[PDB]
Design a protein around this nucleic acid. Sequence first.
DNA 1: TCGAGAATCCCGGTGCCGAGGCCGCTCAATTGGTCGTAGACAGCTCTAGCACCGCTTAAACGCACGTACGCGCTGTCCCCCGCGTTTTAACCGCCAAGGGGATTACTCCCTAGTCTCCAGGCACGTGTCAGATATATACATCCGAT
DNA 2: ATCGGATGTATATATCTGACACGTGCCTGGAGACTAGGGAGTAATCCCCTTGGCGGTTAAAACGCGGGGGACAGCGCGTACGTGCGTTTAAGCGGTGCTAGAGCTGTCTACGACCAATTGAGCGGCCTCGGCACCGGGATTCTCGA
Lengths: 98, 99, 76, 76, 108, 108, 92, 92, 83, 83
Amino acid sequence: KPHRYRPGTVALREIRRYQKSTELLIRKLPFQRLVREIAQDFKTDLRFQSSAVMALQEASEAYLVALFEDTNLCAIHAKRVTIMPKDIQLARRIRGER
Amino acid sequence: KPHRYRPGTVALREIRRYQKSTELLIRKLPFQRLVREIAQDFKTDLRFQSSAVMALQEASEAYLVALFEDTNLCAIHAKRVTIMPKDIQLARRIRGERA
Amino acid sequence: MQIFVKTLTGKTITLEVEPSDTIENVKAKIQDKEGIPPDQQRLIFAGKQLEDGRTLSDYNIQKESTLHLVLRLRGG
Amino acid sequence: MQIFVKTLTGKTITLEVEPSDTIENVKAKIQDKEGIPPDQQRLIFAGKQLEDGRTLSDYNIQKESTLHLVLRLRGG
Amino acid sequence: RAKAKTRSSRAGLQFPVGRVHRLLRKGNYSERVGAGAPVYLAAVLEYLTAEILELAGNAARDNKKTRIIPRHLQLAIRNDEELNKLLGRVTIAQGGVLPNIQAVLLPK
Amino acid sequence: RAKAKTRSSRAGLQFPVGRVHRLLRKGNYSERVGAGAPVYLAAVLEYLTAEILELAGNAARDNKKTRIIPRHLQLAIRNDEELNKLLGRVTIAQGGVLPNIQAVLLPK
Amino acid sequence: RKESYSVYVYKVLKQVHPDTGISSKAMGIMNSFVNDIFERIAGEASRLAHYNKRSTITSREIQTAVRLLLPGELAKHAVSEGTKAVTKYTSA
Amino acid sequence: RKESYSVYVYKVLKQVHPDTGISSKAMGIMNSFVNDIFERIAGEASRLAHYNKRSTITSREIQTAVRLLLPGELAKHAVSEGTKAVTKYTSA
Amino acid sequence: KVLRDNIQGITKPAIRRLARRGGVKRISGLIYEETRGVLKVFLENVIRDAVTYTEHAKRKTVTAMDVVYALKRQGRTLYGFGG
Amino acid sequence: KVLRDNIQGITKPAIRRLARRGGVKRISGLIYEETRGVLKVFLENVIRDAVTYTEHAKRKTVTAMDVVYALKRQGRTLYGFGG
DNA sequence: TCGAGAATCCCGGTGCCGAGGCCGCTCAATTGGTCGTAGACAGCTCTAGCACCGCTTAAACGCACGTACGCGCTGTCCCCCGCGTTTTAACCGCCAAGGGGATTACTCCCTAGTCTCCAGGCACGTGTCAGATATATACATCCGAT
DNA sequence: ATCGGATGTATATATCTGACACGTGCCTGGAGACTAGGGAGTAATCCCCTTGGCGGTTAAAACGCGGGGGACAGCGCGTACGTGCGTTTAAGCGGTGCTAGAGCTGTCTACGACCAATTGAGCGGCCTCGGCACCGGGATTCTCGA
């Protein structure tokens, strides 16, 4: 009989693992490529200091972490356990973005 | 033979009425007494220009209206219609006031 | 019928009026002898602020009156 | 064995060195005849930046060398 | 000297270039102010106020009124989406709110 | 003349009163600045720095470390209530988040 | 001797809508808005000028502040109006 | 030569926790924090000076700016510390 | 002179009217206490800022400009009172 | 010199492991497209600020002191890069 | 499906006070000169951002299965709404009064300005131990089986 | 609940490399001392304007009650997501190179500050007529028990 953790057990372990560390979570080269192709529509030539790209990654990851915290709060408010896209839209409305 | 409106029609009529008018919904003398009571814990003697009192009332009305808008949105997101105290807390918690 | 207009500057002039004359009439009289615009004067008699539309009798301005005058500035 | 140290100012001195001498050794020699601190000099020979720990032979400094010197400022 | 011509007149503007320049000088923003900065700022302010007043007057006309009211101003600002981003943190005294009811609340 | 005694020394502070004064002058905040203002501001900054550093050092000791890390600074700031009020809109590079799991998500 | 923007707002109104009225409260709100935008743009321009080690606020700084504070097509239109006004002023 | 509060922060850290060290990233974060707080307090004091039409920033303006900015207990403690420093500076 | 219990001056019909303007069609019976609490804390913050402004101004009178500055420094700028 | 897609590079396990940091236990299957629409509206609000900072500086390089000062402008302050 | 009935749009009339127009005077915006310096521009140098290549392997990905959870439905009951009746104090108008806000004038003293001196803060180099990494081992947790 | 294999977490030991802490040398920024002069402290004065009190009206608040709709717990289902595995893919790392341009310096020209005189725009005061608020009869419009 093969070993199998029940669903929802590995998720909590991953939560505890990633709430203790400080490592940047998105892959650096894909993120930098995304930033460079986004900036292609404002200035034709840009050079994008590495420290600037690092700051962009840090800010984006912090923003996503906060947004997912608020999304989880909305999901728990809605008597759910999983999050759904409408949970993000509600959180982004109360925050006054959209 | 009493005419009786169904529960909810008068509420919607009041909503439509009160979203059209720009008056203040809180009684001026009780609000001023509340303001003077609140400020008694900072300075013993304060004078509280009537313009300042009106500005405070306008700001409080606008803030409460926005908070109730967000509370209603939370209530509808919870597949509900009535607003509840936990709806207000969630609106403030996301907004950045409930700590 | 002469009453004395005592200004804030301590210079008191001798002004001859009529019992039926008005507060406004006194204002123009000083312009005739000093060139001061009427609207730059604030007349204070008996401690109450005189009004342009009132006469010199409604306030019971007896002769030899110490009329206290305040001068205003157009702009602060 | 003499090589010429040409500064940015256009003043070129005549300096006598040894084949086994170092880049650092030249820096102290100018202090003896001009009082200039060694660390305020940037020696550029053959277009590559000389290093203090290297000798005068590793860069093949032939005689009658036009040694280009850059002077730095402590503070900007 | 020649008859004085206002900087607003020579710049083709209605807002006071001279008064904007004085406010910039007396605001402790910087110790020196460029010549064209007050002109540019006055032009921008005039454009913004014209843009808002156009929508406010349109709202007042829609409301069968010939005067612009704080309610009309609030309606214009919160109906134009580009103005709403400028004044999203601004509350207007005697401005009210727009009529909006969530669809779920309607009778069914 | 008499021996030179620094403003910070004669005020009992460790932060540069002279540098604070220079920044106040060169900041376009006001045309003039008082004598006691730089001292007062330096004292306030020193107190706030000490307040942060005490908690940061305690948190660093909690992890069996003798050096401060941005993780420790983040932990101290987010664990103190009023520092969280000062820096609630401030994100820290390589700081992470506090360990939080909502009680509903815990297994029965 | 209090000074405001009421006359200029009235002129702009008469220019845009040939016949429309302004209540006193509406004029006050317009003055408040004008002061707010002036302070916003001037503060951003001062911060910009200081970030680049400059002692002057020029049309370049004002234009970049307008671009920073104005969203969408409003920024484009404001920049166009500002540059047109500045070039007309320099022409005479 | 660049200027920062690294030395002063290190002295404060030695005063508070004599046995504790600190890293370069922490120096950067502490300099950022000090600069942010300085900017906030200085801007508040500048605004306070203009509202009363005063042309000088003094300890009174800095103190009321501290009261405006800092939260409950920290504001009180910081005002106490600053007042102590001001009296010590004036007396000595 | 001495005032107390004036937080009850925000009556139930006033809160219902505010919710009606906000767009709420049904209100539970526990909303009013929470609304009074949040209104009280918001008022305390704004009035504390206004009082410290009018105390730095060396005055005993809280003008409308003090309230305007108190709201502006919290991001809730208020047009229509001279700010 | 031309980049076209560059948005699937923010992979599904990369949106996870960040939702995990946020603190979620279960994630739907449509969260990823929403989270990619975000962070594309975001950071596009940050560029076009960082640019027109570097453009005002007449540089063509986006320094770290542009991403900072674009943050603290968007209402978020970033430490250690850094002012 | 359709009247009964309450709400609301609507169409005149009448009286009121606020917006807009007019008059004046006065002060700050303008014109016109000087003058010191801010940055515009050219030159140059040295960092570093980009572009390339190969090599290792961690991360992503497609697949398959199961289970728990979101949803949809259903039945209870309870509580908030709408309506009527009684109470109250908000509100409008009026009146008495003092206090402190705003303004003006006198003056004094505190800060910007300038020169001169020197020492403490920055750059630098160096050495050394603190956290990182690997390795082996004990302990707490999970879930399937009883 | 109880056990125990299997998994992951945590702990003790050895080494070990680079970043942090302390020195040294120097040089510009901070400190010491005196002046000129305007900013602000301070004492009066007036009067706007805020506080307190009082009387009448009635709009609004408070209370009570009947019930219909809505909150909410319950139960089934089927489907969508978590978990684990083998495979693919490109991220990560290292090393090299080049040239685009960030950054610093030298000249100097245009540009903004500063000061004297003046006048025309705009702010203050009045004033008056029409937009607008309210009253009421009016027809229309939505709701609700049939």
